[PDB]
Amino acid sequence: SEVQLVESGGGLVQPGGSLRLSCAVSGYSITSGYSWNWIRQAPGKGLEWVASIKYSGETKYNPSVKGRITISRDDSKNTFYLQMNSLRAEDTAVYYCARGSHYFGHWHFAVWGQGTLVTVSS
Amino acid sequence: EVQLVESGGGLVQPGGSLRLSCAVSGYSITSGYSWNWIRQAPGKGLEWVASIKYSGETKYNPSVKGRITISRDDSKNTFYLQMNSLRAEDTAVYYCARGSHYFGHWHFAVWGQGTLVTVSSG
Amino acid sequence: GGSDIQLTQSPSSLSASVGDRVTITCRASKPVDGEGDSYLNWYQQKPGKAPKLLIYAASYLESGVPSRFSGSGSGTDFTLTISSLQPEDFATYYCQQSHEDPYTFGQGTKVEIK
Amino acid sequence: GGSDIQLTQSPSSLSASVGDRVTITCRASKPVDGEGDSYLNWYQQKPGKAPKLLIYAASYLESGVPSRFSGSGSGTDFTLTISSLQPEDFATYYCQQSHEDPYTFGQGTKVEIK
Amino acid sequence: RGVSAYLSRPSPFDLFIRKSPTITCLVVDLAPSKGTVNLTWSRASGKPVNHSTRKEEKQRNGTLTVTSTLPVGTRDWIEGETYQCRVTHPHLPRALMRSTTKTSGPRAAPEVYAFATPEWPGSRDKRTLACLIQNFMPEDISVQWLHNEVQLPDARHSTTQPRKTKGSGFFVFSRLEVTRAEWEQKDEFICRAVHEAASPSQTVQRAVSV
Amino acid sequence: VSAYLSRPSPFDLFIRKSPTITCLVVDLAPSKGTVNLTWSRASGKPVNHSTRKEEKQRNGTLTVTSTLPVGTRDWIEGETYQCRVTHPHLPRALMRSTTKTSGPRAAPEVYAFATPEWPGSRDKRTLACLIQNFMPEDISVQWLHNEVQLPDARHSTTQPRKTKGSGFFVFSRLEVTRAEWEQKDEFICRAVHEAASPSQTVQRAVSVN
Ligand SMILES: *[C@@H]1O[C@H](CO)[C@@H](O[C@@H]2O[C@H](CO)[C@@H](O[C@@H]3O[C@H](CO[C@H]4O[C@H](CO)[C@@H](O)[C@H](O)[C@@H]4O)[C@@H](O)[C@H](O[C@H]4O[C@H](CO[C@H]5O[C@H](CO)[C@@H](O)[C@H](O)[C@@H]5O)[C@@H](O)[C@H](O)[C@@H]4O[C@H]4O[C@H](CO)[C@@H](O)[C@H](O)[C@@H]4O)[C@@H]3O)[C@H](O)[C@H]2NC(C)=O)[C@H](O)[C@H]1NC(C)=O
Ligand SMILES: *[C@@H]1O[C@H](CO)[C@@H](O[C@@H]2O[C@H](CO)[C@@H](O[C@@H]3O[C@H](CO[C@H]4O[C@H](CO)[C@@H](O)[C@H](O)[C@@H]4O)[C@@H](O)[C@H](O)[C@@H]3O)[C@H](O)[C@H]2NC(C)=O)[C@H](O)[C@H]1NC(C)=O
Ligand SMILES: *[C@@H]1O[C@H](CO)[C@@H](O)[C@H](O)[C@H]1NC(C)=O
């Protein structure tokens, strides 16, 4: 069953403002399985894994952004969200949502979204 | 099957000559295989004396070469071992055998009963 | 990020031609082996587009990924191999370890087709 | 002899029982290996009969020879092994090299059944 | 590096008729002296795996055979789940892995044809029955022989592995030797195939007489 | 590494009378240097004209085969042929021998069937052949249309498998076109097996109808 993920909510953001990104999932129900992740790529930098919410509801955060980031889902809309506060210049990046498939206790990102651009300007 | 019969053994004077013949039945000594004379001295190990290939090549053991001849008669399907200048050490049981071929090397798969040659006085 | 497993790739950038064998190395600050497997994955990302998964668990090919891609290694040393580079393989390649939290990626290896 | 290949067997003589395993050793003064094979043959000669071929080329069983006979070894060290000695296996056993001319035999190993 | 590993799919009979599908992870070429192998399962979705039964068998050839059978959900399998088997060996540093999923591609119902051989001299108390099942895809298929509405043991008949047709479809042959006592009781024998593309009930069958 | 040495096909032996045997080596690493493959006859008679064919494989294993023509009379007479495979990586060579099998002989029973017309395949029809209760297992199966033999790619034939009886059995399946059976509605299933008399041939005809 083919799965599609679409990010939305990107844009220009003031420093210190808050950010809400939503990932709309079609073709698969986010409560049925797999782990659902947010991964960002800063301009001219490597990929960074931000946050994950397991199908059963567990959430994990990257220490680098932990404390100012929340990952959530809305079962009715089959959508999950990323909320970040106290944005910085380092937060400027393209945010991708991905579905991680499970292998013997470890997860890899088999399905990715198109990504959405977040720009922060002082 | 193939059968091999030795003949011509007997009492021989020292320094005399010997003619041994091996009558082959069931296979043609020109159709294949190697045809050999092998002697066993009383209570001693086997010694390979001489061979004639089906195609006609002959080989002799250096220990007896020069006083030993191997020949065949296609019409009688028989091969011969001629020995002259006999010595007491030549005293032995003489067997004829058909050698089967393995990638350039021959082993004696079919044997006769052998005939006894005794060369000694006193 | 002293506790985070750092992934270093080399080379940082390379230019090659179609048909070449391309070899990319990923070194880990801590081993990522567990239970007879290595939890190091390889991703391919063309510029400005989203990544694609190529290999998971060090050496297992993801479905639909061309057989010319192959991963190998153990412990802290891993290698992606493109046996016969193609024009559509112009991309940046990343390694990512999923053995330990948080998951981290390498810095990227840009593969330019000269 | 001298330039001829010498074949030495051990033990010279041995006594065993039905069902027992027997092992005979054949040592050559020069190696008899060629082209990935060893040209060492094993013969069984019961009293008053002519020899009979058991194994050719070190380890290949002659047709009709029981499977309890087996040959092994390489170079200058060869071993005939009868897994379960039988009453009809009371015989003298000879090894013979067919690698180099002239072909030579060993001195023989008499196997008596106790 | 002589070890071998195989992962079988659920038989179509187990999937639709019994409605208790299972997949099996088969390990071969292991020495008895080698320590016992650790065998574990994993699902692509991250959902848990059921208890699996492990059987170990000595063989005439000296190589140990180990199998693990895992029950799977009917709707889980049909929906496209990926199950995975992992073999851990003390003597092997790296692990072997085998994966299975519902095979994807076009679907075609199997065509079924059943035939009876004419009697042959010296085989008079004997009769042989044949079935040709072809032009079906995917290759997953099960063949059963029923005599008098009761299905015959799988050991009575021999069926070939699915082979490709000159077209896009597959075909298999099934052969069954029947006794005079059987066909005199009731002279009807049924060749039944179970295939997901067959409609309805995933069953196509043909009857044949001696 | 595995090595197989096959006997002559009954067709080449009895019909063509140009028997050949093939020594097949598989699963050898492509990186490996070429394997040297040689022949030997128990009789000591020469072997010659062996052909060597190398072929890469999708699996990743290189396959090497060597075919050696053999005399029909030599083969039937009981000659023993032997194939030897040597590799630089292998400490010792592998050796395979082949000879005419001795044992009971049974002529093959042959049955030919035509599939009934199926919806959507008006112009396609499948023909089936069952050959059984023959031994030894060595057999050749041909399809002849219009007195002329059909190519080997047109039909599929199974390996000989054991029966509840003592014989072996094989199945042959042939897809024939509507245009072919309208030209001539007769197709021949032929088996070649040494026990078949005479000429080692047993056959059955089947018609589409
Ligand atoms: C790597 O990938 C490669 C390529 O995909 C794989 O290569 C093949 O691997 C096979 C593994 O064994 C093997 O192929 C065959 O092996 C059998 C094994 O025989 C033993 O086991 C069978 C079990 O059923 C049993 O029947 C036997 O008695 C043995 O105990 C060999 O017999 C095969 O040789 C015979 O068959 C071939 C093919 O005949 C069939 O297939 C062709 C199409 O290829 C088809 O035209 C025909 O209709 C048949 O259906 C013949 O070419 C041979 O001459 C042999 O035919 C037998 O029967 C004849 C009756 O007429 C006799 O005349 C004769 O005596 C002979 O025995 C075959 O070698 C190979 O190792 C390898 N290559 C091929 C071409 O298959 C490999 O598995 C894979 N590996 C990995 C690790 O990835
Ligand atoms: C020593 O004995 C061993 C006994 O296990 C031998 O192992 C053999 O290994 C081969 C692989 O080359 C196996 O072949 C397999 O057969 C299965 C058939 O299972 C069926 O499963 C599903 C449903 O359950 C069905 O859909 C399939 O079509 C099958 O019909 C295949 O699934 C495998 O892919 C593979 O073909 C043998 O099964 C296995 N032997 C036995 C007796 O099972 C080993 O080869 C022996 N070694 C020597 C040196 O002789
Ligand atoms: C390879 O086989 C040929 C066959 O005639 C033989 O002459 C040659 O000695 C063999 N190669 C080696 C390296 O022994």
mmCIF file of C-alpha atoms in Angstrom, chain D:
data_model
loop_
_atom_site.group_PDB
_atom_site.id
_atom_site.type_symbol
_atom_site.label_atom_id
_atom_site.label_comp_id
_atom_site.label_asym_id
_atom_site.label_seq_id
_atom_site.Cartn_x
_atom_site.Cartn_y
_atom_site.Cartn_z
ATOM 1 C CA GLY D 1 66.265 -48.816 -7.075
ATOM 2 C CA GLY D 2 67.598 -45.644 -5.448
ATOM 3 C CA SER D 3 66.040 -43.317 -7.997
ATOM 4 C CA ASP D 4 62.867 -45.415 -7.725
ATOM 5 C CA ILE D 5 60.101 -44.336 -5.354
ATOM 6 C CA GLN D 6 60.304 -46.386 -2.150
ATOM 7 C CA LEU D 7 56.987 -47.298 -0.501
ATOM 8 C CA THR D 8 57.050 -48.176 3.208
ATOM 9 C CA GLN D 9 54.059 -49.533 5.131
ATOM 10 C CA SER D 10 53.232 -49.713 8.840
ATOM 11 C CA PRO D 11 52.451 -51.577 10.688
ATOM 12 C CA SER D 12 54.237 -54.521 9.107
ATOM 13 C CA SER D 13 51.774 -56.964 10.710
ATOM 14 C CA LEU D 14 48.714 -56.615 12.941
ATOM 15 C CA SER D 15 46.025 -58.766 14.601
ATOM 16 C CA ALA D 16 42.408 -57.614 15.019
ATOM 17 C CA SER D 17 38.816 -58.780 15.572
ATOM 18 C CA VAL D 18 35.636 -58.766 13.525
ATOM 19 C CA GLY D 19 33.937 -55.383 13.820
ATOM 20 C CA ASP D 20 37.136 -53.523 14.746
ATOM 21 C CA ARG D 21 38.696 -50.668 12.779
ATOM 22 C CA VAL D 22 42.076 -51.245 11.078
ATOM 23 C CA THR D 23 44.427 -48.490 9.873
ATOM 24 C CA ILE D 24 47.408 -49.011 7.539
ATOM 25 C CA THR D 25 50.003 -46.341 6.688
ATOM 26 C CA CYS D 26 51.997 -45.988 3.429
ATOM 27 C CA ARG D 27 55.000 -43.617 3.294
ATOM 28 C CA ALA D 28 56.719 -42.647 0.007
ATOM 29 C CA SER D 29 60.308 -41.439 -0.426
ATOM 30 C CA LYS D 30 59.074 -38.904 -2.998
ATOM 31 C CA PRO D 31 55.663 -37.239 -3.342
ATOM 32 C CA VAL D 32 53.193 -38.865 -5.741
ATOM 33 C CA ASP D 33 50.886 -35.831 -6.121
ATOM 34 C CA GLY D 34 50.007 -34.530 -9.563
ATOM 35 C CA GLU D 35 47.284 -32.202 -10.889
ATOM 36 C CA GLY D 36 45.337 -32.132 -7.607
ATOM 37 C CA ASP D 37 45.378 -35.934 -7.174
ATOM 38 C CA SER D 38 47.591 -38.594 -5.593
ATOM 39 C CA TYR D 39 48.459 -41.638 -7.673
ATOM 40 C CA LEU D 40 48.597 -44.150 -4.843
ATOM 41 C CA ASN D 41 46.632 -47.411 -5.109
ATOM 42 C CA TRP D 42 45.709 -50.059 -2.545
ATOM 43 C CA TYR D 43 45.562 -53.818 -3.196
ATOM 44 C CA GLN D 44 44.271 -56.798 -1.201
ATOM 45 C CA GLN D 45 45.915 -60.187 -1.717
ATOM 46 C CA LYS D 46 44.399 -63.174 0.059
ATOM 47 C CA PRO D 47 46.556 -66.274 0.579
ATOM 48 C CA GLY D 48 47.346 -68.105 -2.635
ATOM 49 C CA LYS D 49 45.356 -65.708 -4.826
ATOM 50 C CA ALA D 50 46.548 -62.854 -6.968
ATOM 51 C CA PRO D 51 46.082 -59.306 -5.665
ATOM 52 C CA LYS D 52 42.788 -57.413 -6.016
ATOM 53 C CA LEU D 53 42.376 -53.664 -6.502
ATOM 54 C CA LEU D 54 40.509 -51.789 -3.752
ATOM 55 C CA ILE D 55 41.290 -48.073 -4.143
ATOM 56 C CA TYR D 56 42.958 -46.162 -6.974
ATOM 57 C CA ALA D 57 44.296 -42.596 -7.005
ATOM 58 C CA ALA D 58 44.554 -42.463 -3.172
ATOM 59 C CA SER D 59 40.849 -42.396 -2.339
ATOM 60 C CA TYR D 60 38.700 -43.664 -5.227
ATOM 61 C CA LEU D 61 36.942 -46.951 -4.545
ATOM 62 C CA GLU D 62 37.174 -49.622 -7.223
ATOM 63 C CA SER D 63 33.843 -50.841 -8.544
ATOM 64 C CA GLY D 64 32.461 -53.673 -6.446
ATOM 65 C CA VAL D 65 34.835 -53.059 -3.528
ATOM 66 C CA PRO D 66 32.890 -52.741 -0.234
ATOM 67 C CA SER D 67 32.382 -49.229 1.123
ATOM 68 C CA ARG D 68 34.089 -50.074 4.441
ATOM 69 C CA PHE D 69 37.440 -49.642 2.625
ATOM 70 C CA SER D 70 38.576 -46.055 2.196
ATOM 71 C CA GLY D 71 41.812 -44.352 1.253
ATOM 72 C CA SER D 72 43.109 -40.931 2.186
ATOM 73 C CA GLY D 73 46.264 -38.861 2.266
ATOM 74 C CA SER D 74 48.443 -36.779 -0.014
ATOM 75 C CA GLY D 75 52.087 -36.213 -0.848
ATOM 76 C CA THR D 76 54.052 -38.910 0.972
ATOM 77 C CA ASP D 77 51.529 -40.023 3.645
ATOM 78 C CA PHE D 78 48.652 -42.336 2.757
ATOM 79 C CA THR D 79 46.315 -44.379 4.905
ATOM 80 C CA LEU D 80 44.021 -47.309 4.162
ATOM 81 C CA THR D 81 41.184 -47.673 6.660
ATOM 82 C CA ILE D 82 38.897 -50.672 7.077
ATOM 83 C CA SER D 83 36.049 -49.367 9.213
ATOM 84 C CA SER D 84 34.794 -52.814 10.355
ATOM 85 C CA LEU D 85 37.200 -55.730 9.881
ATOM 86 C CA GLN D 86 35.671 -58.950 8.528
ATOM 87 C CA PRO D 87 36.770 -62.596 8.367
ATOM 88 C CA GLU D 88 37.336 -62.366 4.608
ATOM 89 C CA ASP D 89 39.594 -59.346 5.184
ATOM 90 C CA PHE D 90 42.371 -61.639 6.479
ATOM 91 C CA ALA D 91 44.935 -60.744 3.845
ATOM 92 C CA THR D 92 48.155 -58.918 3.136
ATOM 93 C CA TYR D 93 47.619 -55.345 1.913
ATOM 94 C CA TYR D 94 49.880 -53.547 -0.563
ATOM 95 C CA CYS D 95 50.080 -49.902 -1.568
ATOM 96 C CA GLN D 96 51.456 -48.994 -4.967
ATOM 97 C CA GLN D 97 52.451 -45.653 -6.492
ATOM 98 C CA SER D 98 51.686 -45.074 -10.163
ATOM 99 C CA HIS D 99 53.066 -41.533 -10.378
ATOM 100 C CA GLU D 100 56.589 -42.169 -11.624
ATOM 101 C CA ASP D 101 58.260 -44.963 -13.571
ATOM 102 C CA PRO D 102 58.878 -47.557 -12.565
ATOM 103 C CA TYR D 103 55.741 -48.333 -10.565
ATOM 104 C CA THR D 104 56.730 -49.774 -7.202
ATOM 105 C CA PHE D 105 54.891 -51.604 -4.447
ATOM 106 C CA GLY D 106 55.161 -51.463 -0.720
ATOM 107 C CA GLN D 107 56.449 -54.414 1.255
ATOM 108 C CA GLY D 108 52.988 -55.421 2.513
ATOM 109 C CA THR D 109 50.888 -55.414 5.713
ATOM 110 C CA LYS D 110 49.509 -58.762 6.904
ATOM 111 C CA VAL D 111 46.128 -58.436 8.658
ATOM 112 C CA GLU D 112 45.277 -61.413 10.886
ATOM 113 C CA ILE D 113 41.825 -61.835 12.466
ATOM 114 C CA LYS D 114 41.893 -62.729 16.206
#
